[PDB]
Design a protein around this motif. Structure first.
Motif, mmCIF file in Angstrom:
data_model
loop_
_atom_site.group_PDB
_atom_site.id
_atom_site.type_symbol
_atom_site.label_atom_id
_atom_site.label_comp_id
_atom_site.label_asym_id
_atom_site.label_seq_id
_atom_site.Cartn_x
_atom_site.Cartn_y
_atom_site.Cartn_z
ATOM 1 N N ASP A 1 19.981 18.183 17.665
ATOM 2 C CA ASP A 1 18.565 17.859 17.794
ATOM 3 C C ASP A 1 18.186 17.536 19.243
ATOM 4 O O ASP A 1 17.115 17.927 19.703
ATOM 5 C CB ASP A 1 18.169 16.704 16.865
ATOM 6 N N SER A 2 19.057 16.834 19.962
ATOM 7 C CA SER A 2 18.771 16.530 21.368
ATOM 8 C C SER A 2 18.726 17.809 22.199
ATOM 9 O O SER A 2 17.847 17.994 23.028
ATOM 10 C CB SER A 2 19.816 15.571 21.938
ATOM 11 N N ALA A 3 19.688 18.703 21.979
ATOM 12 C CA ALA A 3 19.669 19.950 22.722
ATOM 13 C C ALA A 3 18.401 20.756 22.433
ATOM 14 O O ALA A 3 17.810 21.333 23.350
ATOM 15 C CB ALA A 3 20.925 20.773 22.403
ATOM 16 N N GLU A 4 17.966 20.769 21.170
ATOM 17 C CA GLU A 4 16.770 21.514 20.784
ATOM 18 C C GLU A 4 15.543 20.984 21.501
ATOM 19 O O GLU A 4 14.731 21.747 22.034
ATOM 20 C CB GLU A 4 16.519 21.400 19.278
ATOM 21 N N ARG A 5 15.404 19.668 21.491
ATOM 22 C CA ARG A 5 14.254 19.047 22.140
ATOM 23 C C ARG A 5 14.326 19.203 23.658
ATOM 24 O O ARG A 5 13.293 19.313 24.317
ATOM 25 C CB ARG A 5 14.116 17.578 21.701
ATOM 26 N N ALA A 6 15.539 19.255 24.209
ATOM 27 C CA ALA A 6 15.696 19.470 25.651
ATOM 28 C C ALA A 6 15.161 20.846 26.094
ATOM 29 O O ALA A 6 14.886 21.066 27.279
ATOM 30 C CB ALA A 6 17.169 19.296 26.064
ATOM 31 N N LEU A 7 14.991 21.766 25.143
ATOM 32 C CA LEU A 7 14.444 23.083 25.465
ATOM 33 C C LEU A 7 13.000 23.004 25.950
ATOM 34 O O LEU A 7 12.491 23.942 26.578
ATOM 35 C CB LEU A 7 14.552 24.031 24.267
ATOM 36 N N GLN A 8 12.336 21.881 25.689
ATOM 37 C CA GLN A 8 10.980 21.680 26.211
ATOM 38 C C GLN A 8 10.958 21.653 27.734
ATOM 39 O O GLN A 8 9.899 21.803 28.349
ATOM 40 C CB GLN A 8 10.397 20.364 25.698
ATOM 41 N N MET A 9 12.122 21.442 28.345
ATOM 42 C CA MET A 9 12.227 21.481 29.799
ATOM 43 C C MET A 9 12.144 22.907 30.366
ATOM 44 O O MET A 9 12.052 23.084 31.583
ATOM 45 C CB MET A 9 13.521 20.799 30.270
ATOM 46 N N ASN A 10 12.193 23.915 29.493
ATOM 47 C CA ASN A 10 12.039 25.314 29.920
ATOM 48 C C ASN A 10 10.674 25.520 30.578
ATOM 49 O O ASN A 10 9.650 25.075 30.044
ATOM 50 C CB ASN A 10 12.190 26.259 28.726
ATOM 51 N N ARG A 11 10.680 26.173 31.739
ATOM 52 C CA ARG A 11 9.473 26.442 32.545
ATOM 53 C C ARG A 11 8.903 25.193 33.212
ATOM 54 O O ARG A 11 7.833 25.247 33.830
ATOM 55 C CB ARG A 11 8.381 27.132 31.721
ATOM 56 N N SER A 12 9.608 24.071 33.110
ATOM 57 C CA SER A 12 9.150 22.857 33.781
ATOM 58 C C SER A 12 9.548 22.871 35.253
ATOM 59 O O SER A 12 10.407 23.662 35.675
ATOM 60 C CB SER A 12 9.695 21.607 33.088
ATOM 61 N N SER B 1 17.617 27.045 28.020
ATOM 62 C CA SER B 1 17.796 27.802 26.791
ATOM 63 C C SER B 1 19.081 27.355 26.152
ATOM 64 O O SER B 1 19.935 26.775 26.830
ATOM 65 C CB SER B 1 17.876 29.291 27.117
ATOM 66 N N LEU B 2 19.237 27.629 24.853
ATOM 67 C CA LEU B 2 20.532 27.460 24.213
ATOM 68 C C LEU B 2 21.502 28.503 24.753
ATOM 69 O O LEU B 2 21.174 29.696 24.814
ATOM 70 C CB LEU B 2 20.437 27.615 22.696
ATOM 71 N N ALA B 3 22.697 28.064 25.132
ATOM 72 C CA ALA B 3 23.693 28.984 25.681
ATOM 73 C C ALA B 3 24.078 29.990 24.616
ATOM 74 O O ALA B 3 24.289 29.616 23.463
ATOM 75 C CB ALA B 3 24.920 28.241 26.131
ATOM 76 N N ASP B 4 24.173 31.258 25.004
ATOM 77 C CA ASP B 4 24.654 32.271 24.077
ATOM 78 C C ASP B 4 26.169 32.176 23.967
ATOM 79 O O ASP B 4 26.834 31.639 24.853
ATOM 80 C CB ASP B 4 24.251 33.667 24.559
ATOM 81 N N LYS B 5 26.717 32.711 22.880
ATOM 82 C CA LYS B 5 28.165 32.733 22.678
ATOM 83 C C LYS B 5 28.791 34.036 23.173
ATOM 84 O O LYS B 5 28.098 35.051 23.337
ATOM 85 C CB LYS B 5 28.478 32.508 21.192
ATOM 86 N N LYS B 6 30.097 33.999 23.426
ATOM 87 C CA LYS B 6 30.798 35.134 24.024
ATOM 88 C C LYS B 6 30.660 36.464 23.280
ATOM 89 O O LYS B 6 30.395 37.478 23.916
ATOM 90 C CB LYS B 6 32.277 34.814 24.290
ATOM 91 N N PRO B 7 30.858 36.475 21.943
ATOM 92 C CA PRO B 7 30.771 37.787 21.276
ATOM 93 C C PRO B 7 29.417 38.475 21.405
ATOM 94 O O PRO B 7 29.375 39.699 21.543
ATOM 95 C CB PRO B 7 31.072 37.458 19.804
ATOM 96 N N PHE B 8 28.336 37.698 21.380
ATOM 97 C CA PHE B 8 27.003 38.201 21.652
ATOM 98 C C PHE B 8 26.929 38.777 23.074
ATOM 99 O O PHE B 8 26.467 39.908 23.269
ATOM 100 C CB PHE B 8 26.010 37.047 21.456
ATOM 101 N N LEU B 9 27.399 38.018 24.066
ATOM 102 C CA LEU B 9 27.316 38.462 25.466
ATOM 103 C C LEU B 9 28.163 39.698 25.704
ATOM 104 O O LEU B 9 27.743 40.636 26.387
ATOM 105 C CB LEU B 9 27.757 37.348 26.421
#
Length: 363
Positions: free
Chosen positions: A229-240, A250-258
């Motif tokens: 929940d803290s990480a999710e709310r920290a996304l409000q810092m995007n574009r700040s 942003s939420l970090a992507d995982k290796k298999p996706f990348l």
RNA sequence: GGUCAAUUUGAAACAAUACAGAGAUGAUCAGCGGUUCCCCUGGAUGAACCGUUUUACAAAGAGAC
């Protein structure tokens, strides 16, 4: 799924008993998914593992316990407490290698099962069924912690509920943010902590090295929060704004996706300089890792390790891409590899489009 | 030119490789629409291909209207 629930162990089958005869003997019990037969240690009799479609089939098989096959009195039982889970064997270890490990400590192996690399090229673990709880405990005793090629082997009595936390679990759990486009001045753990700790407890901050030292225009950092929940709310810092710099969060992507997005770039490439340095090999099992392919190219084809730039799986077309260092080497490898044998099967070489065309024809 | 935009770059993907089966996955390989081929006497399949939903920021920009 629950493989064990419907699986039985048969002991003391005749030496002459094969997989086929096992089927015929038990197929009236109920539909069978799989049968494995293995010699006893001294080859005087055989064991079988029979996985039934349904529990009633396993029950019916167990009614055959102490019946006579040939002149052998068999024992049929639920397969229980006879399964190991193993991980962190070397990247190029095969089923045969694992079988040989147990052979060395005089443990009969009935089944060794490895995972699909389809959605994650790095997957590496195995399930192994043995013939007794005693042998299973003995495998843990002798093999857990064993060092093989620099890798500390993990061997456990199988129970997925007891699975360890992965070292990358924070990313899997959505607790890690990536902060992008920091200036070098702002690439400071103290400043990042001060700016984000209001959202929740920070477990860890990771700053890739070399960014200040190479005077990057844009720098990145990763921050792990104790809860999602803290990480999710920290996304409000995007574009700040941080100082005079607009940051991305942003939420970090995982290796298999990348890693897959990297392969997708290759499959879509129209740069002929790039394409002419690679070949595809197909068809290949989706259990086959880049490390296994690399070993094959070096040991069987006598290619030097440094002639190979990269090996990527493309399991959606039953293939792999091998990127070499120049187009001339790639062209010669195209010729040499086409029709060669890998894992007892003939493989083809070709371009990406050849690989796709071959796949389309089989479908 | 004015919007639309293959891709390239800024740029660093950290965190230990592994770390629980096709029992895995995020369009990561998804959903929908639409022409084609396959097989019937407009239809039923399966597959491929093409579009729409989706996508941090910034600079440039093959090629298109």
């Amino acid at each position: 799924r629950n493989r064990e629930l419907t699986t039985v162990l048969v002991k003391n089958l005749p030496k002459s008993y094969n997989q086929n005869k096992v089927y015929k003997y038990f197929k009236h019990c109920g539909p069978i998914i799989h049968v494995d037969v293995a010699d006893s240690l001294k080859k005087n009799f055989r064991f079988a593992r029979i996985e039934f479609a349904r529990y009633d089939g396993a029950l019916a098989a167990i009614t055959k316990t102490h019946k006579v096959v040939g002149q052998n009195e068999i024992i049929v039982s639920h397969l229980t407490e006879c399964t190991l889970w193993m991980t962190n064997f070397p990247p190029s270890y095969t089923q045969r290698n694992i079988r040989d490990l147990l052979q060395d400590i005089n443990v009969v192996a009935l089944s060794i099962r490895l995972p699909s690399l389809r959605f994650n090229t790095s997957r590496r673990f195995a399930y192994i069924d043995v013939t007794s709880k005693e042998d299973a405990r003995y495998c843990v005793e002798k093999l857990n912690g064993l060092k093989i090629e620099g890798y500390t082997l993990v061997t456990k009595v199988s129970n997925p509920l007891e699975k360890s936390k992965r070292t990358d679990s924070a990313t899997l759990e959505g607790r890690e943010i990536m902060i992008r486009n920091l200036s070098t001045e702002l690439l400071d753990e103290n400043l990042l902590r001060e700016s984000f700790e209001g959202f929740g407890s920070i477990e860890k901050i990771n700053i890739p090295a070399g960014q200040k030292e190479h005077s990057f225009n844009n720098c990145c950092a990763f921050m792990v929060f104790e809860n999602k929940d803290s990480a999710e709310r920290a996304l409000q810092m995007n574009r700040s704004l941080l100082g005079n710099r607009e940051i991305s969060v942003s939420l970090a992507d995982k290796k298999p996706f990348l890693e897959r997005n990297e392969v997708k770039r290759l499959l879509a490439s129209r740069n002929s300089k790039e394409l002419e340095t690679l070949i595809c090999l197909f068809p290949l099992s989706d259990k086959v890792s880049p490390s296994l392919i690399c070993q094959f190219l070096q040991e069987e084809i006598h290619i030097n390790e440094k002639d190979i730039r990269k090996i990527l799986l493309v399991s959606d077309f039953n293939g792999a891409i091998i990127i070499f260092r120049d187009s001339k080497f790639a062209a010669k490898m195209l010729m040499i590899l086409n029709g060669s044998q890998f894992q007892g099967k003939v493989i083809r070489s070709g371009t990406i489009n050849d690989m796709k065309r071959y796949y389309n024809n089989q479908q």
